[PDB]
Design a protein around this ligand. Structure first.
Ligand SMILES: [Cl-]
Length: 147
């Protein structure tokens, strides 16, 4: 298998042009059915949010192949969990999410909450338990940071 040079194996950083390059490469390297590049008008972050059915909607004949190819390029789930954390807490970066997820043992829910209490703790002299209490009381809504 010959990879397309100048295309890193980090799909979370792929541009729209990189997605088109990956599609063209995949169609030729795996002899797939013709893929209209106009059917994947998105960047790499968006590609990670598609389900296998979403791939099939765009390419009934080779969409699931492309999905499995993406899964193997990603390898041994974390990149998608990181995106879910980044989509749940304002101001959290890739590294902040990865640190929180590793602390919570892959738990997205606990990582989001630990990150939410961190942000709330960053604004008051209250103890972390008081921050954990207000957030548990307010159903884990960080928007209720009223003072
Ligand atoms: Cl990635």
């Amino acid at each position: 298998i010959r990879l397309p040079a100048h295309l890193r194996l980090q799909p979370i950083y792929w541009s729209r042009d990189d997605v088109a390059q990956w599609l063209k490469w995949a169609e030729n390297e795996f002899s797939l059915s013709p893929i209209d590049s106009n059917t994947f008008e998105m960047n790499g972050k968006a590609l990670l949010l598609l389900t296998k059915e979403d791939f099939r909607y765009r390419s009934p004949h080779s969409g699931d192949e492309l999905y499995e190819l993406l899964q193997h390029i990603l390898g041994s789930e974390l990149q998608r969990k990181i995106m879910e954390v980044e989509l749940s807490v304002h101001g959290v970066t890739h590294q902040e999410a990865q640190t929180a997820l590793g602390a919570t043992g892959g738990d997205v829910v606990s990582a989001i909450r630990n990150l939410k209490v961190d942000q709330l703790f960053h604004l008051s002299s209250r103890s972390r338990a008081d921050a954990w209490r207000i957030l548990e009381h307010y159903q884990w809504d960080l928007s209720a940071a009223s003072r």
